[PDB]
Structure 1
């Protein structure tokens, strides 16, 4: 018979079925909205959905009726200024644009104001969504401190869709990423070169650090690159394809994400942890153990355990480098209290030694 891990994987997959019709309504609405926004004359006319993946391995931890989508907007001629030395935050300035900067009126001094740009973004979405007549779509009351523009869809049960604006820049990647994406021994040098020729994204995010520059800071996003890696994750090109062999790489990611999700429900001490920490850890593990034969499906329980051990060691050393931005320590004392990491370590060790009873629930 199958062990608990395989049962949990089966159950996780079957959950996709309960979310499918809502997911379809979401795509319907988003696509209508994008068309309306693309028809209209505004600084957001060029907006498009950035595809980041929708399966459990790709998305953040969420309620079954909560969705997130990123709307990307190409912004030519950005001059980036590192705001944090780690590369955690940036200010957005501009180089010379002889024909005129189309985002000119979103500037505050030399810097692009996320506050001004999001305010207009919110206003336009609210106006267009009012024109959707066949399905009840409104905009949730703005949550001070949250940049998402949240759609509420009622058909007739309520679905929430957080819309996140992402600036698209086609310039070379920021200097803070120079040693990031360490995939040379795994996906290799040509893939790394190709991936780094793609755009990078900037998403509005406030730092929690005083009044100066609030509403003017952005963090980098590589959601596109991350999707690509998740779906092209083998040293062999045929990994998980029909004329290749399956590996257990995504299964380990899913198990570890679900472990954290279930733990986060039980213990609000774990509020500062998110699925991105898990995805980051596993990117590092995929780099350390690049061979597809080091992720054989036969070895699921051993591979999951070596991922736990790795994550536990990141917790113990208080260090988990962003995979794209090596100086950005996601497990710094300032982002996550030492006592929270010690608490999570203790919970993980407990689960690992008792056959994962937290997976026994619904």
Structure 2
């Protein structure tokens, strides 16, 4: 019941000071890397993007894995969609990145190739810390570093565009009944970001918007600022991420749930905030019912084989192109069992 979930949340708090130390280790390495990068002409205007709850730039993703985004101010960007994918684009210009231009197009692989070299150079140069360097399979996390042989950080290069959001997002960010039309208009005036994921295509990124709507998450502007308005939205997201983490830990050898990530969990959770816009639907005292709402919607997404991207609704995260049908059935079976029996996975 709800007291079992509160105990899970209390136990997760116990690792708060360990996560803070690990994040501080990441911050020191990133800040060193930021210094060098600003010496290269192509990356002269690089800075850290405000995406996480540690300082402002280190984003927790899993127990000992962090995410960091370097933003690059790039003006006069023109986008051309790569064939009805809605998510992927070529980058044009109507400048420092001239070396990576092939025709009128900006090569993500050439820009990404130099980025890696500089970081790989500077990782070796100064070692008052044990820092190594991996290449994760997908190029969306551009570089992965391993600090003290425990902490891993994904570093992502992103182009910053101050232009109006692409037309594929016109029907996304469906927050009007929850956070208001005024807030939706404000958010869409902010920049958007382009990260090199696979041709030489770029994918849109809204990491800065996720942080904003997580930390300013109520219908009431004073949600969670006083004892009378304590909701459980953040705790429900934490429990959902931890549920997936704990289930994945049971299949270390086979990696049966390898295709599922906290990105999927977060997407479903923000759809549930859309569906349940009132702060009274997230009363802290209703933790058990609210968590059930989140789990039940996730199950529905698994069974209908459909999880819409929060910003580009025509992009289905759960299409069989991306996640095998049998993988979705397997996770459906695991979660359905956990829900029907009060989440034994959380038992001590």
TM-score of the two chains, using structure 2 as the length reference: 0.91
Question: In the alignment, which residue of structure 1 is the partner of 2:21?
Answer: 21
Q: Deviations over 1:14-66 (max 9, x none)?
A: 2222222221121122112212322x1421011111121137xx9564342x3
Match of 1:102 in 2: 96
Which residue number corresponds to residue 219 of structure 2?
Answer: 235
Q: How far apart in 1 are the matches of 2:138 and 2:176? A: 39
Shift of 1:178: 0.3
Q: Match of 2:8? A: 8
Q: Take 1:336 and 1:144, find their aligned partners in 2: how far apart are those partners?
A: 16
Partner of 1:89: 88
Equivalents in 2 of 1:158, 1:309: separation in Å? 35
Deviation at 1:280, TM superposition (A): 0.9
Q: Secondary structure at the match of 2:237?
A: helix
Instruction: Provide the residue aligned with 2:243 in structure 1.
Output: 259
Distance across 2 between alignment mates of 1:190 and 1:19? 35
Classify 1:84/1:223 alpha carbon distance in 2 versus 1 (closer, same or farther; 3 Å). Answer: farther
Cα 1:297/1:141, change in 2 over 3 Å:
closer
C-alpha separation in 2, matches of 1:49 and 1:188: 29
Mean alpha-carbon deviation: is it higher for 344-353 or for 83-92? 83-92
Contact 1:60 1:275 in 2 (8 A): no
Partner of residue 179, structure 1: 171
Alignment partner of 1:305 is 2:292: yes
C-alpha separation in 1, matches of 2:240 and 2:137: 32
Deviation at 1:144, TM superposition (A): 6.2
Which of 298, 308, 332 aligns to 1:321? It is 308
Preserved contact between residue 100 and residue 111 of structure 2 (Cα < 8 Å): yes
Q: 2:183 aligns with which of 188, 191, 206?
A: 191
1:82-231 equivalences under 5 Å are 82-95=81-94, 101-132=95-126, 134-138=128-132, 140-142=133-135, 145-146=138-139, 147-154=141-148, 157-206=149-198, 213=199, 216-231=200-215
Contact 2:232 2:283 in 1 (8 A): yes
- Contact 2:123 / 2:131 at 8 angstroms: preserved in 1? yes
**What SS does structure 2 have at the residue aligned with 1:103?**
helix
Residues 106, 328 of structure 1: alpha-carbon distance in 2 compared, 3 angstrom cutoff? same
- 1:152-192 CA deviation, whole Å, 9 max, x = no partner? 333xx543222111111111101100011111111111111
Is 2:60–2:66's contact at 8 Å kept on the other side of the alignment?
no
Output one character per residue of 1:118-167: Cα deviation in whole Å (capped at 9) or x when no partner: 111112223334443543444x154565452223333xx54322211111
Aligned-residue CA RMSD in angstroms? 2.1
Kindly provide the CA deviation profile for residues 297-338 of structure 1, in whole angstroms up to 9, marking residues without a partner as x. Answer: 111101111111111111111111111111111111211122
Alignment-derived partner of residue 51 in structure 1 = 50
Q: Following the alignment from structure 1 to structure 2, what is the Cα–Cα distance between the partners of residues 142 and 348?
A: 32
Mapped partners of 1:326, 1:185: distance in 2 = 17
- Asked if structure 1 preserves the Cα contact closer than 8 Å seen for 2:134 and 2:145, the reply is no
Query: Contact 2:162 / 2:190 at 8 angstroms: preserved in 1?
Result: yes
Q: Give the Cα separation in 2 of the matches to 1:342 and 1:133.
A: 46
The alpha-carbon distance between structure 1 residues 181 and 2, as it changes in their structure 2 partners (threshold 3 A), is: closer
How far apart are the structure 2 equivalents of 1:137 and 1:114? 26
* Structure 1 unmatched ranges of 5 or more: 96-100, 207-212
Aligned length: 341
Change beyond 3 A, Cα 1:257–1:292 = same
On the 8 A contact 2:100/2:107 being kept in 1, the answer is yes
Asked whether the 8 Å contact 2:51–2:208 carries over to 1, the reply is yes
Q: Distance in 2 between matches of 1:236 and 1:50?
A: 27
